[PDB]
Amino acid sequence: FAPPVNVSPLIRAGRYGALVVGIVYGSYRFGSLQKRENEWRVEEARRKVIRDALNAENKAKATREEMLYLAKETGVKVPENF
Amino acid sequence: GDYPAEYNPKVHGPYDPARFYGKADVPLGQVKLGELSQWLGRRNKNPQAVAAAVSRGWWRWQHKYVLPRKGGIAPYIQLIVGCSIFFYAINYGKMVAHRQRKYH
Protein backbone atom coordinates (compact mmCIF):
# COMPACT_ATOMS: atom_id res chain seq x y z
CA PHE A 1 0.00 0.00 0.00
CA ALA A 2 0.99 3.62 0.53
CA PRO A 3 4.00 4.31 2.78
CA PRO A 4 3.09 5.21 6.37
CA VAL A 5 2.83 8.89 7.31
CA ASN A 6 2.66 9.73 11.01
CA VAL A 7 -0.51 11.09 12.57
CA SER A 8 -0.65 14.68 13.77
CA PRO A 9 0.31 15.02 17.47
CA LEU A 10 -3.22 16.00 18.48
CA ILE A 11 -5.36 13.21 16.97
CA ARG A 12 -3.60 10.52 19.01
CA ALA A 13 -3.97 12.39 22.31
CA GLY A 14 -7.65 13.06 21.68
CA ARG A 15 -8.18 9.44 20.62
CA TYR A 16 -6.53 7.74 23.59
CA GLY A 17 -7.91 10.34 25.99
CA ALA A 18 -11.42 9.52 24.82
CA LEU A 19 -10.44 5.84 25.00
CA VAL A 20 -9.60 6.12 28.71
CA VAL A 21 -12.71 8.21 29.45
CA GLY A 22 -14.89 5.56 27.82
CA ILE A 23 -13.32 2.83 29.96
CA VAL A 24 -13.97 4.50 33.32
CA TYR A 25 -17.44 5.69 32.29
CA GLY A 26 -18.05 2.19 30.97
CA SER A 27 -17.00 0.73 34.32
CA TYR A 28 -19.06 3.29 36.26
CA ARG A 29 -22.24 2.85 34.23
CA PHE A 30 -21.98 -0.96 34.07
CA GLY A 31 -21.63 -1.21 37.84
CA SER A 32 -24.50 1.22 38.39
CA LEU A 33 -26.81 -0.70 36.05
CA GLN A 34 -25.58 -4.04 37.43
CA LYS A 35 -26.99 -3.00 40.79
CA ARG A 36 -30.07 -1.73 38.96
CA GLU A 37 -30.37 -4.99 37.00
CA ASN A 38 -30.03 -7.06 40.18
CA GLU A 39 -32.70 -5.12 42.07
CA TRP A 40 -35.03 -4.90 39.06
CA ARG A 41 -34.76 -8.61 38.24
CA VAL A 42 -35.57 -9.61 41.83
CA GLU A 43 -38.76 -7.55 41.99
CA GLU A 44 -39.68 -8.53 38.42
CA ALA A 45 -39.33 -12.22 39.30
CA ARG A 46 -41.49 -11.88 42.43
CA ARG A 47 -44.31 -10.13 40.58
CA LYS A 48 -43.96 -12.57 37.67
CA VAL A 49 -44.47 -15.57 39.99
CA ILE A 50 -47.56 -13.96 41.55
CA ARG A 51 -48.90 -13.02 38.10
CA ASP A 52 -48.18 -16.49 36.69
CA ALA A 53 -49.89 -18.15 39.66
CA LEU A 54 -52.99 -15.99 39.15
CA ASN A 55 -52.87 -16.58 35.39
CA ALA A 56 -52.57 -20.32 36.05
CA GLU A 57 -55.80 -20.20 38.08
CA ASN A 58 -57.49 -18.20 35.31
CA LYS A 59 -56.21 -20.65 32.69
CA ALA A 60 -57.48 -23.57 34.77
CA LYS A 61 -60.93 -21.97 34.95
CA ALA A 62 -61.01 -21.19 31.21
CA THR A 63 -59.90 -24.70 30.24
CA ARG A 64 -62.67 -26.25 32.35
CA GLU A 65 -65.17 -23.93 30.64
CA GLU A 66 -63.68 -24.97 27.29
CA MET A 67 -63.95 -28.63 28.33
CA LEU A 68 -67.52 -27.98 29.45
CA TYR A 69 -68.24 -26.37 26.07
CA LEU A 70 -66.81 -29.39 24.23
CA ALA A 71 -69.01 -31.84 26.15
CA LYS A 72 -72.05 -29.67 25.44
CA GLU A 73 -71.16 -29.67 21.73
CA THR A 74 -70.37 -33.39 21.50
CA GLY A 75 -73.32 -34.44 23.66
CA VAL A 76 -71.20 -37.05 25.46
CA LYS A 77 -71.66 -37.79 29.16
CA VAL A 78 -70.32 -35.21 31.62
CA PRO A 79 -68.20 -36.82 34.38
CA GLU A 80 -68.31 -35.72 38.00
CA ASN A 81 -64.81 -34.22 37.84
CA PHE A 82 -65.28 -32.76 34.34
CA GLY B 1 -37.87 13.26 -22.09
CA ASP B 2 -35.29 15.01 -24.25
CA TYR B 3 -31.72 16.25 -24.21
CA PRO B 4 -31.36 19.29 -21.90
CA ALA B 5 -31.64 22.65 -23.63
CA GLU B 6 -28.42 23.92 -22.05
CA TYR B 7 -26.49 21.31 -24.05
CA ASN B 8 -24.59 22.62 -27.07
CA PRO B 9 -23.05 20.01 -29.40
CA LYS B 10 -20.88 22.58 -31.19
CA VAL B 11 -18.81 23.67 -28.18
CA HIS B 12 -18.96 20.67 -25.84
CA GLY B 13 -19.15 17.90 -28.42
CA PRO B 14 -21.15 14.70 -28.06
CA TYR B 15 -23.59 14.46 -25.18
CA ASP B 16 -22.37 12.93 -21.92
CA PRO B 17 -25.01 12.38 -19.21
CA ALA B 18 -22.40 12.58 -16.42
CA ARG B 19 -21.33 16.15 -17.28
CA PHE B 20 -23.28 19.22 -16.20
CA TYR B 21 -24.12 21.19 -19.35
CA GLY B 22 -25.19 24.45 -17.71
CA LYS B 23 -23.04 27.35 -16.63
CA ALA B 24 -19.78 26.20 -15.04
CA ASP B 25 -20.52 26.59 -11.33
CA VAL B 26 -17.91 26.21 -8.60
CA PRO B 27 -18.58 22.85 -6.89
CA LEU B 28 -19.20 22.50 -3.17
CA GLY B 29 -15.88 20.71 -2.59
CA GLN B 30 -13.82 23.91 -2.77
CA VAL B 31 -16.37 26.08 -0.95
CA LYS B 32 -14.63 27.35 2.19
CA LEU B 33 -17.89 27.01 4.25
CA GLY B 34 -18.20 30.78 4.40
CA GLU B 35 -20.01 30.61 1.06
CA LEU B 36 -22.01 27.52 2.10
CA SER B 37 -25.26 29.44 2.68
CA GLN B 38 -24.77 31.35 -0.57
CA TRP B 39 -23.98 28.14 -2.48
CA LEU B 40 -27.02 26.29 -1.10
CA GLY B 41 -29.39 29.19 -1.76
CA ARG B 42 -28.05 29.72 -5.28
CA ARG B 43 -28.69 26.14 -6.40
CA ASN B 44 -32.40 25.76 -7.07
CA LYS B 45 -34.48 22.99 -5.50
CA ASN B 46 -36.91 22.22 -8.31
CA PRO B 47 -38.11 18.63 -8.75
CA GLN B 48 -36.67 18.94 -12.26
CA ALA B 49 -33.32 20.20 -10.95
CA VAL B 50 -32.87 17.49 -8.31
CA ALA B 51 -33.95 14.78 -10.77
CA ALA B 52 -31.36 16.01 -13.26
CA ALA B 53 -28.84 16.19 -10.42
CA VAL B 54 -29.55 12.56 -9.53
CA SER B 55 -29.13 11.36 -13.12
CA ARG B 56 -25.94 13.39 -13.52
CA GLY B 57 -24.66 11.72 -10.37
CA TRP B 58 -25.88 8.27 -11.37
CA TRP B 59 -24.16 8.46 -14.74
CA ARG B 60 -21.01 9.67 -12.98
CA TRP B 61 -21.13 6.50 -10.89
CA GLN B 62 -21.73 4.45 -14.03
CA HIS B 63 -18.70 6.14 -15.58
CA LYS B 64 -16.54 5.08 -12.64
CA TYR B 65 -17.63 1.50 -12.01
CA VAL B 66 -19.51 -0.01 -15.00
CA LEU B 67 -18.82 1.86 -18.26
CA PRO B 68 -15.07 1.07 -18.19
CA ARG B 69 -14.25 -2.08 -20.12
CA LYS B 70 -13.07 -4.26 -17.23
CA GLY B 71 -16.02 -3.55 -14.94
CA GLY B 72 -16.00 -6.07 -12.12
CA ILE B 73 -18.61 -7.18 -9.60
CA ALA B 74 -17.79 -4.25 -7.30
CA PRO B 75 -20.62 -1.94 -8.51
CA TYR B 76 -23.21 -4.70 -8.13
CA ILE B 77 -22.01 -5.47 -4.61
CA GLN B 78 -22.02 -1.77 -3.73
CA LEU B 79 -25.64 -1.44 -4.86
CA ILE B 80 -26.77 -4.43 -2.78
CA VAL B 81 -25.13 -3.15 0.41
CA GLY B 82 -26.30 0.36 -0.45
CA CYS B 83 -29.90 -0.78 -0.85
CA SER B 84 -29.68 -3.02 2.23
CA ILE B 85 -28.32 -0.17 4.35
CA PHE B 86 -30.98 2.21 3.04
CA PHE B 87 -33.81 -0.27 3.56
CA TYR B 88 -32.66 -1.21 7.05
CA ALA B 89 -33.04 2.41 8.13
CA ILE B 90 -36.52 2.43 6.59
CA ASN B 91 -37.54 -0.73 8.46
CA TYR B 92 -35.78 0.49 11.63
CA GLY B 93 -39.12 0.86 13.41
CA LYS B 94 -39.94 -2.82 13.01
CA MET B 95 -36.39 -3.96 13.77
CA VAL B 96 -35.87 -1.85 16.91
CA ALA B 97 -39.23 -2.99 18.32
CA HIS B 98 -37.72 -6.44 18.99
CA ARG B 99 -34.01 -5.86 19.85
CA GLN B 100 -31.83 -8.20 21.94
CA ARG B 101 -30.72 -6.37 25.11
CA LYS B 102 -33.26 -5.15 27.66
CA TYR B 103 -30.94 -2.42 28.97
CA HIS B 104 -27.99 -2.01 26.52
Binding site: - | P17, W59, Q62, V66, L67, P68, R69, K70, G71, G72, Y76, L79, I80, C83, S84, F87, Y88, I90, N91, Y92, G93, K94, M95, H98
Partner: protein, 219 residues
Protein backbone atom coordinates in the same frame (compact mmCIF):
# COMPACT_ATOMS: atom_id res chain seq x y z
CA UNK C 1 -36.10 -24.97 18.39
CA UNK C 2 -36.55 -21.64 20.18
CA UNK C 3 -39.22 -19.47 18.50
CA UNK C 4 -40.32 -17.92 15.21
CA UNK C 5 -41.33 -14.58 13.71
CA UNK C 6 -43.26 -13.32 10.70
CA UNK C 7 -44.82 -10.15 9.22
CA UNK C 8 -42.05 -8.81 6.99
CA UNK C 9 -44.66 -7.42 4.55
CA UNK C 10 -45.61 -4.02 5.98
CA UNK C 11 -45.62 -1.37 3.21
CA UNK C 12 -45.80 1.66 5.53
CA UNK C 13 -43.37 0.87 8.36
CA UNK C 14 -41.86 4.35 7.85
CA UNK C 15 -42.94 7.59 6.19
CA UNK C 16 -40.66 6.68 3.29
CA UNK C 17 -42.87 3.74 2.40
CA UNK C 18 -41.89 0.35 0.98
CA UNK C 19 -43.03 1.33 -2.52
CA UNK C 20 -39.36 2.19 -3.09
CA UNK C 21 -38.69 -1.55 -2.78
CA UNK C 22 -40.35 -1.88 -6.19
CA UNK C 23 -38.21 0.92 -7.65
CA UNK C 24 -34.96 -0.98 -6.92
CA UNK C 25 -34.82 -2.94 -10.25
CA UNK C 26 -34.53 0.41 -12.05
CA UNK C 27 -31.04 0.67 -10.57
CA UNK C 28 -29.97 -2.77 -11.81
CA UNK C 29 -31.02 -2.02 -15.40
CA UNK C 30 -27.90 -1.93 -17.56
CA UNK C 31 -27.91 1.56 -19.02
CA UNK C 32 -25.78 1.53 -22.16
CA UNK C 33 -23.52 4.35 -23.32
CA UNK C 34 -20.59 3.18 -25.43
CA UNK C 35 -20.65 1.54 -28.85
CA UNK C 36 -18.62 -1.46 -27.73
CA UNK C 37 -20.56 -2.61 -24.66
CA UNK C 38 -19.20 -3.21 -21.19
CA UNK C 39 -18.95 -6.61 -19.52
CA UNK C 40 -22.35 -6.61 -17.73
CA UNK C 41 -24.14 -5.15 -20.76
CA UNK C 42 -22.86 -7.91 -23.02
CA UNK C 43 -23.82 -10.52 -20.42
CA UNK C 44 -27.33 -9.10 -20.16
CA UNK C 45 -27.59 -8.75 -23.94
CA UNK C 46 -26.39 -12.32 -24.51
CA UNK C 47 -28.87 -13.67 -21.96
CA UNK C 48 -31.83 -11.76 -23.40
CA UNK C 49 -30.91 -12.58 -27.00
CA UNK C 50 -30.55 -16.18 -25.87
CA UNK C 51 -34.06 -16.17 -24.40
CA UNK C 52 -35.45 -14.49 -27.52
CA UNK C 53 -33.94 -17.25 -29.66
CA UNK C 54 -35.40 -19.95 -27.40
CA UNK C 55 -38.83 -18.30 -27.37
CA UNK C 56 -38.72 -17.84 -31.16
CA UNK C 57 -39.95 -21.42 -31.57
CA UNK C 58 -43.13 -20.57 -29.62
CA UNK C 59 -43.91 -17.00 -30.70
CA UNK C 60 -46.53 -17.28 -33.43
CA UNK C 61 -48.16 -14.48 -35.43
CA UNK C 62 -50.50 -13.23 -32.69
CA UNK C 63 -47.45 -12.42 -30.54
CA UNK C 64 -45.50 -10.96 -33.46
CA UNK C 65 -43.93 -8.20 -31.38
CA UNK C 66 -45.16 -9.01 -27.88
CA UNK C 67 -41.94 -10.83 -26.94
CA UNK C 68 -40.68 -7.56 -25.43
CA UNK C 69 -43.58 -7.70 -22.97
CA UNK C 70 -42.84 -11.35 -22.13
CA UNK C 71 -39.13 -10.68 -21.56
CA UNK C 72 -39.93 -7.60 -19.48
CA UNK C 73 -42.30 -9.76 -17.46
CA UNK C 74 -39.47 -12.26 -17.01
CA UNK C 75 -36.98 -9.66 -15.77
CA UNK C 76 -39.58 -8.14 -13.46
CA UNK C 77 -40.34 -11.53 -11.88
CA UNK C 78 -36.64 -12.33 -11.50
CA UNK C 79 -35.83 -9.00 -9.85
CA UNK C 80 -38.82 -9.38 -7.52
CA UNK C 81 -37.70 -12.84 -6.38
CA UNK C 82 -33.93 -12.35 -6.24
CA UNK C 83 -34.26 -9.04 -4.41
CA UNK C 84 -36.84 -10.53 -2.04
CA UNK C 85 -34.28 -12.94 -0.59
CA UNK C 86 -31.75 -10.31 0.48
CA UNK C 87 -32.17 -9.82 4.25
CA UNK C 88 -33.34 -6.30 5.05
CA UNK C 89 -35.84 -5.97 2.19
CA UNK C 90 -39.57 -6.52 2.63
CA UNK C 91 -41.05 -9.31 0.51
CA UNK C 92 -42.64 -7.44 -2.39
CA UNK C 93 -44.05 -10.59 -4.01
CA UNK C 94 -45.78 -11.47 -0.73
CA UNK C 95 -48.10 -8.52 -1.36
CA UNK C 96 -50.89 -9.80 -3.59
CA UNK C 97 -51.10 -6.51 -5.52
CA UNK C 98 -47.75 -7.29 -7.16
CA UNK C 99 -49.10 -10.73 -8.05
CA UNK C 100 -52.40 -9.13 -9.06
CA UNK C 101 -50.43 -6.94 -11.47
CA UNK C 102 -48.44 -9.97 -12.63
CA UNK C 103 -51.29 -12.25 -13.69
CA UNK C 104 -54.64 -10.46 -13.98
CA UNK C 105 -54.06 -7.77 -16.67
CA UNK C 106 -52.10 -10.08 -18.98
CA UNK C 107 -54.59 -12.94 -18.61
CA UNK C 108 -57.48 -10.61 -19.46
CA UNK C 109 -55.37 -9.42 -22.40
CA UNK C 110 -54.91 -12.97 -23.67
CA UNK C 111 -58.43 -14.27 -23.05
CA UNK C 112 -60.20 -11.25 -24.59
CA UNK C 113 -57.91 -11.23 -27.63
CA UNK C 114 -58.59 -14.96 -28.02
CA UNK C 115 -62.35 -14.43 -27.64
CA UNK C 116 -62.47 -11.60 -30.20
CA UNK C 117 -60.20 -13.34 -32.71
CA UNK C 118 -61.09 -17.05 -32.34
CA UNK C 119 -64.30 -17.37 -30.32
CA UNK C 120 -65.15 -20.94 -31.34
CA UNK C 121 -61.56 -22.12 -30.81
CA UNK C 122 -61.56 -20.51 -27.36
CA UNK C 123 -64.71 -22.45 -26.48
CA UNK C 124 -63.14 -25.56 -28.03
CA UNK C 125 -60.19 -25.10 -25.67
CA UNK C 126 -62.70 -25.50 -22.82
CA UNK C 127 -63.49 -29.02 -24.11
CA UNK C 128 -60.97 -31.87 -24.44
CA UNK C 129 -60.39 -32.67 -28.10
CA UNK C 130 -62.45 -35.49 -29.58
CA UNK C 131 -64.88 -35.60 -26.65
CA UNK C 132 -68.08 -37.61 -27.26
CA UNK C 133 -71.55 -36.43 -26.27
CA UNK C 134 -71.99 -38.27 -22.89
CA UNK C 135 -68.46 -37.22 -21.87
CA UNK C 136 -68.94 -33.59 -22.96
CA UNK C 137 -70.75 -31.44 -20.39
CA UNK C 138 -68.92 -32.20 -17.14
CA UNK C 139 -65.54 -31.73 -18.83
CA UNK C 140 -66.72 -28.39 -20.24
CA UNK C 141 -67.92 -27.02 -16.89
CA UNK C 142 -64.78 -28.04 -14.99
CA UNK C 143 -62.47 -26.68 -17.70
CA UNK C 144 -64.51 -23.46 -17.69
CA UNK C 145 -63.71 -23.27 -13.97
CA UNK C 146 -60.13 -24.29 -14.79
CA UNK C 147 -59.48 -21.57 -17.37
CA UNK C 148 -61.19 -18.92 -15.22
CA UNK C 149 -59.06 -19.54 -12.10
CA UNK C 150 -55.83 -20.83 -13.71
CA UNK C 151 -54.12 -17.38 -13.83
CA UNK C 152 -55.29 -16.76 -10.26
CA UNK C 153 -53.28 -19.81 -9.25
CA UNK C 154 -50.38 -18.43 -11.29
CA UNK C 155 -50.50 -15.31 -9.10
CA UNK C 156 -50.71 -17.54 -6.03
CA UNK C 157 -47.75 -19.59 -7.29
CA UNK C 158 -45.50 -16.54 -7.70
CA UNK C 159 -46.46 -15.34 -4.22
CA UNK C 160 -46.25 -18.70 -2.45
CA UNK C 161 -42.69 -19.56 -3.49
CA UNK C 162 -41.20 -16.39 -2.02
CA UNK C 163 -43.51 -16.47 1.01
CA UNK C 164 -42.49 -20.06 1.79
CA UNK C 165 -38.88 -19.25 0.93
CA UNK C 166 -38.71 -16.25 3.24
CA UNK C 167 -40.64 -18.01 6.01
CA UNK C 168 -38.11 -20.84 5.92
CA UNK C 169 -35.13 -18.48 6.06
CA UNK C 170 -36.57 -16.44 8.93
CA UNK C 171 -37.35 -19.67 10.78
CA UNK C 172 -33.77 -20.90 10.42
CA UNK C 173 -32.32 -17.55 11.45
CA UNK C 174 -34.51 -17.07 14.52
CA UNK C 175 -33.63 -20.53 15.89
CA UNK C 176 -29.92 -19.72 16.13
CA UNK C 177 -27.68 -17.94 18.61
CA UNK C 178 -24.65 -15.76 17.93
CA UNK C 179 -22.65 -16.95 20.94
CA UNK C 180 -22.88 -20.68 20.16
CA UNK C 181 -20.46 -21.45 17.34
CA UNK C 182 -21.99 -24.89 16.71
CA UNK C 183 -25.54 -23.55 16.34
CA UNK C 184 -24.46 -20.55 14.25
CA UNK C 185 -22.43 -22.72 11.85
CA UNK C 186 -25.32 -25.19 11.53
CA UNK C 187 -27.77 -22.33 10.95
CA UNK C 188 -25.49 -20.65 8.40
CA UNK C 189 -24.82 -23.89 6.50
CA UNK C 190 -28.53 -24.77 6.53
CA UNK C 191 -29.42 -21.37 5.08
CA UNK C 192 -26.72 -21.70 2.40
CA UNK C 193 -28.29 -24.97 1.24
CA UNK C 194 -31.72 -23.35 1.47
CA UNK C 195 -30.57 -20.25 -0.42
CA UNK C 196 -29.13 -22.42 -3.20
CA UNK C 197 -32.53 -24.08 -3.41
CA UNK C 198 -34.32 -20.73 -3.22
CA UNK C 199 -32.09 -19.08 -5.82
CA UNK C 200 -32.56 -22.06 -8.15
CA UNK C 201 -36.35 -22.15 -7.79
CA UNK C 202 -36.63 -18.36 -8.24
CA UNK C 203 -34.84 -18.46 -11.60
CA UNK C 204 -36.77 -21.55 -12.72
CA UNK C 205 -40.10 -20.03 -11.61
CA UNK C 206 -39.33 -16.98 -13.73
CA UNK C 207 -38.34 -19.22 -16.65
CA UNK C 208 -41.51 -21.31 -16.54
CA UNK C 209 -43.71 -18.21 -16.30
CA UNK C 210 -42.04 -16.84 -19.41
CA UNK C 211 -42.65 -20.20 -21.09
CA UNK C 212 -46.29 -20.33 -20.00
CA UNK C 213 -47.02 -16.81 -21.22
CA UNK C 214 -45.22 -17.45 -24.51
CA UNK C 215 -47.40 -20.52 -25.06
CA UNK C 216 -50.56 -18.64 -24.10
CA UNK C 217 -49.71 -15.62 -26.26
CA UNK C 218 -49.06 -17.87 -29.27
CA UNK C 219 -52.69 -19.02 -29.27
Amino acid sequence: MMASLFSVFDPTSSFLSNWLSMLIPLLFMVMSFWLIPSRPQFLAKSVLMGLNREMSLLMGPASFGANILVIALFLFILFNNFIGLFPYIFTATSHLAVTLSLAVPLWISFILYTWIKETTNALAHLVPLGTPAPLMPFMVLMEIISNMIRPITLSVRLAANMIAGHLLLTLLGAQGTLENLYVTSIVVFSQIILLMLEFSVAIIQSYVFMTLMTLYASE
